């Protein structure tokens, strides 16, 4: 089929070229499922989605539907929402609370652990119930977020995240109380491949630095103070991961496009006063100047994306090469004052939702790109990923890791780089950090 040799040629971080085919080949999508999605660590939401016992949430891992349910022992199990008898969906609502999961087709019942504990007419018909339960999937946690994985061979969550953790924490680890998820999961369909969504949150600040959000910006300044005086951010840096194709990027010294993007009360909370300094000292154990560090974007390959400063975070569920679902939600500091928790809710609605003054323009590019990639010619020549090629340092004063300029494609090169590895290397032996 698609030889390991062929896959390797689709990406090249040396010269900086991407075969446009990656966003569009059906064969490459289906192999993405088996080799990327059936072996990666996929975000499912937060602990605060399932506080009590039995509390569940139907969600996805690639194109496999999963129940993430809270346990008796306060742990969290995650399993394929599929009764192994004849295929039926076991848990049939979006969220709620369970003492039991019954399969409506033939009765086969289940408990919140996800174990098969009764089969109607067991003896007259039939087999061991313990070996015929819904394919179990590994579960782990990082400062709130839940992730899962089907592959026993894969490196544990903490290892997999690697040196990306310092940057994740900037959102998550700002208090010992932790983050909590404001209820409600936003969902919408986007006709565009997942990697643009992933890449945009990885390396792309360029889009915001240039044209995409000119309208987004215009929205948040008085009728008197009109955009004929536009001040675009310049200073900031981008992180490439040591392994696994994650990445982040942010501005430094610039409360410019955060006051216009998020209002005063949320700036004067992320930057000033008691709650701001508490954060810097909780994570200033990497030399991190987090109070002057605004407008961050980040991805955890494949599909966990979020804007730490802003606090919206989403999973792109793949729906073929031409389609993804955005399942978004926002995060708050659990101990934060209510007025600021309202300011975090209101703004994640105004800006990062289907009708969001920012998200609309975000999705448009990807929408309009995916349309173009239908053509033979539009898929027959390399795409330019050459921003800051070999310009990122191996060490930096204020920020750890492989670090470049904010407007660059180093994280992106990493992302497509790791994407290629997983697609080409069937033996976990080779791939593990």
């Amino acid at each position: 089929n698609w030889t390991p040799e062929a896959i390797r040629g689709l990406v090249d971080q040396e010269k900086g070229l991407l075969d446009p085919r990656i966003y569009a080949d059906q064969s490459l999508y289906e192999l993405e499922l088996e080799r990327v999605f059936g072996r990666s660590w996929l975000l499912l939401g937060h602990e605060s989605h399932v506080p009590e016992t039995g509390d569940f949430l139907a969600t996805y891992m690639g194109e496999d539907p999963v129940v993430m349910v809270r346990q008796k022992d306060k742990s969290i199990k995650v399993f394929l929402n599929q009764c192994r008898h004849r295929g039926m969906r076991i848990c049939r609502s979006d969220a709620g609370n369970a003492k039991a999961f019954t399969c409506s087709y033939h009765g086969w019942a289940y408990d919140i652990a996800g174990k098969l504990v009764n089969v109607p007419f067991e003896k007259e018909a039939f087999f061991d119930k313990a070996e015929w339960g819904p394919l179990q999937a590994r579960v782990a946690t990082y400062k709130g977020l839940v992730f899962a994985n089907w592959d026993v061979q894969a490196p544990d969550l903490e290892t997999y995240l690697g040196d990306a953790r310092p940057y994740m924490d900037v959102m998550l680890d700002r208090t010992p109380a932790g983050t909590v998820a404001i209820g409600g999961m936003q969902k919408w369909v986007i006709p565009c491949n997942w990697k643009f969504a992933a890449e945009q949150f990885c390396s792309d600040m360029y889009h915001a630095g240039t044209t995409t959000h000119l309208s987004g910006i215009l929205a948040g300044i008085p009728p008197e103070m009109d955009l004929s005086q536009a001040q675009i951010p310049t200073k900031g840096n981008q992180f490439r991961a040591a392994w696994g194709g994650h990445g982040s990027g942010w501005y430094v010294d610039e409360p410019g496009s955060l006051l216009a993007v998020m209002g005063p009360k949320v700036t004067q909370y992320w930057t000033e006063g008691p709650a701001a300094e508490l954060a810097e000292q909780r994570l200033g154990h990497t030399g991190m100047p987090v109070r002057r560090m605004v407008g961050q974007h980040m991805t955890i390959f494949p599909t966990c994306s979020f804007l730490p400063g802003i606090n919206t975070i989403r999973t792109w569920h793949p729906r073929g090469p031409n389609e993804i679902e955005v399942w978004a939600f926002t995060l708050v500091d659990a101990d934060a004052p209510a007025e600021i928790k309202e300011e975090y809710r209101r703004h994640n609605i105004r800006n990062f939702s289907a009708g969001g003054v920012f998200e609309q323009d975000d999705g448009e590019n990807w929408v309009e790109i995916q349309k173009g990639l239908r053509g033979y010619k539009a898929k027959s020549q390399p795409l330019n990923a050459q921003m800051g090629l070999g310009r990122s340092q191996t060490g930096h004063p204020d920020f750890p890791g492989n670090v470049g300029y904010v407007y660059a494609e180093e994280a992106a090169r990493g992302m497509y780089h790791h994407w290629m590895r997983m697609m080409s290397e069937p033996s976990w032996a080779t791939l593990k950090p």
Partner: protein, 182 residues
């Protein structure tokens, strides 16, 4: 955060009142459908609460949890200023999602008019299909109901909007955006 059947009044609004509101909605639709955003915007009152919760698939036992709440995220949850910025964005030469603009039709029917304790303020229920056509070949069809509070006003439309809640018949959104207003 749970909606239920609209509480229609036992005695129907008079034929005049019903017509005035109906015509107001048809005028509203003409504004929106012809992208006269500014004149549309001028209909909103200072206190406007423009809201559209998320709906979820719930088992019947858990039916009272169908809609998102006040301390949850919504598709829209706006005030005069947030509505103005949205208006500002959609009219921008450089706002790509609506340059080039979409083509929509707001089809209004099922208008139920309820009088409030305050004269000249009315609670109004209506149904809609919103048809959005876009780019070359994109069609998005939306359906639901609107729950309005409307006050008589001296604009060329005869009313202004004080509260709009929108019950969209959707769990997950089939469309890639909500660049349009309901």
């Amino acid at each position: 955060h749970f909606f239920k059947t609209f509480e229609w009044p036992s005695k129907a609004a008079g034929l005049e009142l019903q017509n005035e509101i109906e015509q107001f909605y048809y005028r509203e639709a003409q504004l929106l459908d012809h992208r006269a955003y500014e004149a549309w915007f001028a209909l909103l009152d200072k206190d406007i609460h423009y809201f559209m919760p998320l709906r979820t698939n719930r088992m019947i036992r858990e039916g009272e949890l169908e809609y998102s709440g006040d301390q949850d995220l919504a598709h829209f949850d706006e005030t005069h200023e947030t509505m103005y910025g949205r208006i500002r964005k959609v009219t921008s030469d450089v706002g790509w999602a609506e340059n080039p603009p979409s083509r929509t039709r707001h089809l209004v029917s099922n208008v139920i008019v309820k009088e409030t304790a305050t004269p000249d303020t009315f609670e109004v229920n209506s149904a809609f299909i919103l048809y959005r056509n876009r780019l070359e070949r994109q069609v998005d069809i939306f359906a639901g109901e609107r729950r309005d509070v409307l006050r008589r006003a001296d604009n060329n439309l005869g009313f202004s909007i004080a509260k709009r809640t929108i019950l969209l018949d959707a769990s997950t959104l089939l469309s890639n955006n909500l660049s349009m207003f309901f």
